[PDB]
Design a protein around this nucleic acid. Structure first.
Ligand SMILES: [Fe+2]
Length: 872
DNA sequence: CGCGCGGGA
DNA sequence: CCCGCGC
């Protein structure tokens, strides 16, 4: 977020052009440009981006999400004068309080109303109790009294809550998540009346949003229940309609949930007073709100002065009436526990699968349990983010390791003297040069060997935010504190300022976008500034300066070591990237052999990534839910091979585990933090769906492919990429590029990079080849959605039962196809999918997890094992 | 192989 | 919409 400016995020279904006009008028009076954007997946995008201290200055969303944001410290406290607060209705301010603090400005107010056909029903009923008799009349006329969405409890809750239901008890400025109001007599009475309506055929238990909307807008039912978003559609129809107070139940008003569109201020915003002034003096005025409202209607409004104007529309007046008789929707993330439990209870009670009493008894206890576990997982997440490696660092160990490293440097120097230079395998390594193309030979059936630098330029210098560590003492400090043990005397360590790293990340994605999401001139310009580390073994540590926001979340209350280097004091270090050079031998034989076995046996699924950026082959423990009949680990070819093999059903599973474990073993010898990361993030329920004793569940494979610069947001904390070559020839380009670290390299005999793929922008330049040479690239990574879904399937059916279910589902689908054709087989699979989906959601509702994940971002931590350094 | 159908959200 | 799947 740039100082002296305002950027606003607001959903696409809003009046952003009108809002942009208010910005226009604001820029005119102040000189401060206001840019209005409507990103996709806005509800998810804001907490993900603001968690890194970036994103908009102002966010527009339903107030209920803003309590979760406040828990995460994403929002600035709002400080309106009492004179300003008087201009908005008092209950709208209650909607934007968290822990006694105002956290947003209310804008608009929405709630469900009763919508009725004036021609079928000139005087709509005041009571729910009237509706049975009224439906008898209209049934005689070939019509019905009432149709509304019965599938979503947002819609049925106003009746259920009328006589006493509630979500969480509110008291002393806080919701008590132990106190759920789902199982009291009021709730029971309301749901009973609802199910009696279905029991007496006045409503259909299958009625959903689309069925009700179509029936009301076609003149077939006299009433529906909907919000202001539905008025447009009714306005295109022939129906003469009104909007009024919801019916009472037992003389009490129906209690719809109230949603308040609100404007929050990013805690990481340099422009908080500019934001406050724009919101208080430009938007929250009649002129302001009208400009927005003319673009797309706001519905009811929080500003008393404009609401008095709008309320001349009786539909708006009714909205505010229903809203004032309703309950503000609780603004805490545990509402998800509430929603799932009540949705289940209403569906079961409407289908007779449970009595009303059993349905609500179980929703009550289930919602409370899920909300409690939700809290417990949030606190556990803080422990994993702040976890520390087993301590091997000390001042004595530092110094001894510094001696051994200094000895190894002399020995490597002497060995370089005796050989005439530095070599990685057979490849001559000279850091004075950048390796732009190079030759490989294939003298035998082993892997092709990198032999000769072909095209080069002088090697660009390191960027200024990246520093090679010269001191063996500092080398030993970081090695012992971070669980990195690179080849003695034959590696280079680097320190990278965390703030510049983040700026450079953003510049790299800016360049990729400007190029049209490809390697074009802007990405090339950055590549020309990257320093080649081809043939080197290196590690990059980032240093986060103690806040006296950010992408990185070190705990500066954790234990502190004394650095030999004074400049680390007041900072935390983490490992962002490491490049290894694996000596060809037994391990490389095993790995290459498994790739060959899996290719020959057709076990890779071929997919396209990033539109048509490149082609990628995948294997591993996927769960492809797009495949309706998938109910076990692996791609569809893997499911099939277990049944169709006439030798050994698990053969490809053995191959995959050896492949992941062998790559993992090679990496773990150098990076002892890797098994610590595995042990920390993989749950007991996730472990059977990893590949062996690793943090890998998915493995990719690419053949002479470039890849645009990007981040892998849905993967683990660290990712492993390797390359190996087949056949001889010359490759130009194809470098792996880490532009925010300012480095690139050509993979040689068997280069491996281990890096934080969710937070370091990276990519592979396109390549050109001469001869038959093939560069095979492969990522081993954690794709957490698959392990979560599989862990959930495991909890629902039993881990070992998945193969049996998978075999049965394959057989039942083949049978249908062979008997009744392709369309029948697709119908069997769709049925399987909905059965699978229901089971997964139930386990997901029970907080069953394969991996630990950030509750705020829905992703894995940006880094782990931060080490604080302090030198008094 | 292409392009259909498909799930989840 | 997308590091699937099957006609
Ligand atoms: Fe990647």
């Amino acid at each position: 977020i740039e100082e002296g400016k305002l950027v606003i995020w607001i959903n696409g279904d809003k009046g952003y052009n009108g809002l942009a006009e208010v910005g226009k008028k604001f820029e005119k009076d102040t000189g401060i440009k206001v840019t209005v954007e409507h990103p996709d997946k806005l509800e998810e995008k804001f907490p993900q981006v603001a968690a890194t201290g970036d994103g908009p200055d102002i966010i527009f969303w339903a107030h209920d999400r803003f309590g979760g944001y406040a828990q995460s410290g994403l929002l600035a406290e709002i400080t309106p004068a009492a004179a300003f607060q008087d201009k908005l209705y008092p209950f709208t301010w209650d909607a934007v309080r968290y822990n006694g603090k105002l956290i947003a400005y209310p804008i608009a107010v929405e709630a469900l109303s009763l919508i009725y056909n004036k021609d079928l029903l000139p005087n709509p009923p005041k009571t729910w109790e009237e509706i049975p008799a009224l439906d008898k009349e209209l049934k005689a006329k070939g019509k019905s009294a009432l149709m509304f969405n019965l599938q979503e409890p947002y819609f049925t809750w106003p009746l259920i809550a009328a006589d006493g239901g509630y979500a969480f008890k509110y008291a002393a400025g806080k919701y008590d998540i132990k106190d759920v109001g789902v199982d009291n007599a009021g709730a029971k009475a309301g749901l009973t009346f609802l199910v009696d309506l279905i029991k007496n055929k006045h409503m259909n238990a299958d009625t959903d949003y689309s069925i009700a909307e179509a029936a009301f807008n076609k003149g077939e039912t006299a009433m529906t229940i909907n919000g202001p978003w539905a008025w447009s559609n009714i306005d295109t129809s022939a129906v003469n309609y009104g909007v009024t107070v919801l019916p009472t139940f037992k003389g009490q008003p129906s209690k719809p949930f109230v949603g308040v569109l609100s404007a929050g201020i990013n805690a990481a915003s340099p422009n908080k007073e500019l934001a406050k002034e724009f919101l208080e003096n430009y938007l929250l005025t009649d002129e302001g709100l009208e400009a927005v409202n003319k673009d797309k209607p706001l519905g009811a409004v929080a500003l008393k002065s404009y609401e008095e104007e709008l309320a001349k529309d009786p539909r708006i007046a009714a909205t505010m009436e229903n809203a004032q008789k309703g309950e503000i929707m609780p603004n805490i993330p545990q509402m998800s526990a509430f929603w799932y439990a009540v949705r289940t209870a209403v569906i079961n009670a409407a289908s007779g699968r449970q009595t009303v009493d059993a349905a609500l008894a179980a929703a009550q206890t289930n919602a409370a349990r899920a909300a409690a576990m939700s809290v417990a997982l949030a606190s556990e997440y803080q422990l994993v983010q702040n976890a520390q490696l087993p301590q091997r660092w000390s001042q004595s160990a530092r110094k001894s390791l510094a001696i051994l490293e200094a000895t190894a440097r002399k020995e490597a120097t002497a060995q370089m003297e005796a050989a005439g230079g530095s070599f990685c395998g057979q490849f001559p390594v000279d850091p004075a040069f950048k390796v732009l193309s190079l030759e490989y030979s294939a003298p035998n059936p082993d892997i092709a060997r990198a032999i000769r630098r072909v095209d080069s330029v002088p090697n660009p210098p390191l960027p200024s935010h990246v520093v090679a560590i010269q001191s063996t003492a500092v080398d030993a400090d970081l090695s012992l504190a971070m669980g990195v043990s690179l080849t003695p005397g034959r590696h280079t360590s680097y320190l990278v300022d965390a703030r510049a790293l983040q700026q450079s990340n953003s510049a790299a994605v800016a360049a990729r976008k400007a190029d049209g999401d490809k390697w074009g001139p802007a990405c090339d310009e950055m590549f020309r500034g990257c320093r080649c580390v081809t043939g080197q073994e290196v590690v990059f540590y980032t240093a986060v300066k103690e806040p006296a926001g950010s992408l990185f979340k070190p705990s500066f209350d954790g234990p502190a070591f004394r650095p030999s280097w004074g400049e680390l004091s007041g900072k935390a270090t983490g490992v962002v990237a490491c490049v290894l050079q694996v000596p060809i031998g037994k391990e490389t034989d095993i790995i290459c052999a498994e790739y060959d076995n899996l290719v020959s046996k057709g076990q890779f699924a071929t997919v396209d990534r990033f539109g048509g950026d490149h082609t990628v082959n995948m294997t591993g423990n996927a769960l492809i839910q797009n495949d309706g009949k998938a109910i076990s680990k692996g791609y569809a070819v893997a499911h099939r091979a277990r049944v169709t093999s006439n030798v050994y059903g698990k053969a490809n599973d053995v191959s995959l585990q050896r492949l992941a474990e062998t790559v993992w073993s090679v990496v773990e010898k150098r990076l002892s933090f890797m098994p610590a990361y595995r042990d920390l993030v993989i749950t007991e329920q996730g472990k059977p769906f990893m590949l062996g004793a690793t943090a890998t569940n998915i493995i990719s494979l690419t053949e002479n492919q470039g890849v645009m610069l990007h981040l892998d947001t849905d993967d683990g904390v660290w990712t492993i990429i390797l390359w190996f070559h087949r056949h001889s020839g010359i490759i130009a380009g194809g470098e792996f590029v880490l532009p925010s670290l300012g480095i690139s390299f050509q993979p040689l005999d068997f280069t491996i990079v281990v890096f934080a793929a969710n937070t370091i922008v990276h990519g592979t330049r396109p390549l050109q080849t001469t001869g038959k040479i093939i560069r095979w690239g492969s990522s081993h990574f954690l794709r957490f959605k698959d392990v979560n879904a599989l862990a959930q399937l495991g909890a629902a059916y039993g881990v070992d039962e998945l193969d049996a279910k998978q075999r049965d589902q394959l057989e039942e689908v083949d049978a249908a196809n062979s008997k009744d054709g392709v369309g029948a087989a697709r119908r069997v699979a769709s049925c399987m999918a909905a059965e699978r989906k229901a089971a997964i959601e139930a386990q997901k509702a029970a907080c069953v997890r394969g991996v630990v994940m950030n509750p705020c971002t829905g992703r894995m931590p940006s880094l782990l094992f931060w080490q604080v350094w302090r030198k008094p």
